[model samples]
Target: RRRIATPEEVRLPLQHGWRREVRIKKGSHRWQGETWYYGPCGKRMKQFPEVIKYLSRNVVHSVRREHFSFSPRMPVGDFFEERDTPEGLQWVQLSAEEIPSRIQAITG
Candidate 1:
């Protein structure tokens, strides 16, 4: 069975960290879901092995929430803001054509 990783495990080095807290915006498909933003880390992940591995696993699930904290280094606040709770954040929306088709095709 798939095990849910702990916060500490999620904070492991990039080589070891199996997942990342991606800041995504809603997409036009309204059907597809959200779009990830372009940040420094996001830029690096464009070629990151973890991303490739995760995509290779081919999981199908809806991304309705974020899992990482927003910090100056992440610049998450620049794009999203809290509503009532810290978990409540507003994100921008992207178009379906804007999403990477290759990345979207991956599935386990």
Candidate 2:
């Protein structure tokens, strides 16, 4: 594995209401978990590969991948919504739904 310094907090605002966000890793993982995006309709892209698949279909001439970040840039502890009560505040933790198959890659 490689090592590098993390990015500082910075606001990312882009075209067509497409905003990027970085969710912090939990108590166990020391490093930040990296970043994802919210495009039109507030759709979630869990990883860079998904983002690419999105653009491959609907990418416009004016927009390009250069405008987006491939690496984890700004880091935050947890992204949440402001609310009144302790449980009212909701932290967004968009996790992968399927069983990861990286082990299959190695085994095969």
Best by TM-score: 2
Task: Estimate, for each residue in 47-82, the C-alpha lDDT of model 2 and write its tens digit.
Answer: 767877777888465545545554443332223222
Query: Once superposed on the true structure, which residue ranges of model 2 sit more than 4 Å away at CA?
Result: 1-13, 27-29, 75-108
lDDT score, candidate 2: 0.47
The lowest-lDDT stretch of 10 consecutive residues in candidate 2 is 98-107
Model 1 C-alpha RMSD to native: 14.6
lDDT of 2 at 73: 30
After the best TM-score superposition of candidate 1, give how far the Cα of residue 105 lies from its true spot, in angstroms.
24
Best by lDDT: 2
Per-model CA lDDT versus the true structure: 0.33, 0.47
Residue pair clashes in candidate 1? 58-107, 58-108
